[PDB]
Hints:
By secondary structure, this protein is α/β, with parallel strands linked by helices. It has helices at 22-28, 34-44, 74-77, 85-100, 123-136, 141-156, 175-185, 254-266, 301-313, 331-344, and strands at 13-16, 50-54, 56-57, 60-64, 104-110, 162-166, 190-193, 198-199, 209-212, 223-224, 226-227, 269-271, 277-279, 281-285, 317-321, 324-325, 328-329, 362-363. Helices cover 32% and strands 17% of the residues. The strands form six sheets. It has a seven-stranded parallel sheet. It has a three-stranded antiparallel sheet with strand order 10-9-18, with no helix packed on it. The chain is globular and about 60 Å long. It binds calcium ion. Calcium ion binds at residues 223-224, 243, 247. The PDB classes it as hydrolase. Keywords: fucan, fucoidan, glycoside hydrolase, retaining mechanism, hydrolase.
Amino acid sequence: GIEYNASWMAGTWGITQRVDGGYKLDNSADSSNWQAGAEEIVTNIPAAEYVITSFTHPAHGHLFTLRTNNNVDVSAIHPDMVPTLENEKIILDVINIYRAAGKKVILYLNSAGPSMAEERGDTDIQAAWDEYYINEWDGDEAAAWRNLARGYVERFDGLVDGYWLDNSRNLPGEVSDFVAMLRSVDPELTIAVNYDQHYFTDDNGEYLYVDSDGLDDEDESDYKIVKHVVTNEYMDFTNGHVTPLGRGAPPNSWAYEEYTIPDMIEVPWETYDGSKYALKHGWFPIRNSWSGSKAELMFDVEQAYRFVRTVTDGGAAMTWSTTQDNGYMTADEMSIMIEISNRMTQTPKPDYSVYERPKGAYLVSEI
Length: 367
Ligand SMILES: [Ca+2]
């Protein structure tokens, strides 16, 4: 029938606390305290109602935050795909901290799975995986990966509320089949899929392009303006990815305030198939990086508060792609989120600074 699985998310905002996967987690765990990091987020950011954390390592579908798998011994494919037993408890501990605090949990999962190991330089893992699905699944990589992912999905069952599926153009097999696996475990999961970005066009089909962000922008590269669309029958919320950072689009682009966010709140729910409805959701990097804590901090309180208010007032949702520094939210971001949360829990909520086009910011079409 008709489904609004993300109805709980409408009018809410979230933060991100990624956990490392596989051998990367074994390398970072000795200097990290993700559990303390999660307690600090709970204490300091009560206004955020959910968190995105990690099934796979960021941009590395072959590296998992859990080890044990009742469906396949992943450690026997290649040990570097999975962390130690001691370290697999980090993700579970973080999730339980958020559950006790009443925060919903969405897990980032890079859809490519082990198929992308060589893309990140992990050639030994790639060879082991390729040998595994060839010999054990008679060359059916799609079934091999669904089986493997299912064994972790089952462990997270009832502990998490949704999934954010990255890199779905590179999923072995079909998205429909992978989402069906997820829903076979828990059909109420709130699921986003990142296929490709869509962009604002004019009445004759040309893309809109930002020409400048301000007076003497350091990066003059023209960039397109992301539009969040409901493009398939599987999704419960739009993935929310900004215009790619590599194209020189700042994650706090003024154009997101003139186009992207207004469009999110103009029509906060849309349907592709006529039965399942999906919620408009944006995922904004707070730095000039999705996951890199050392990148330039791009938002300040006043702009970040206006992003949260404009989205949530409209009945849409947004997540900050905050970063982790030894398991804690990077401290400059934490400082901002404290202030945002404190404003968002006041009644009345304090007014946000009104949006004005930055001096010397223009579209190519406006010149
Ligand atoms: Ca572009």
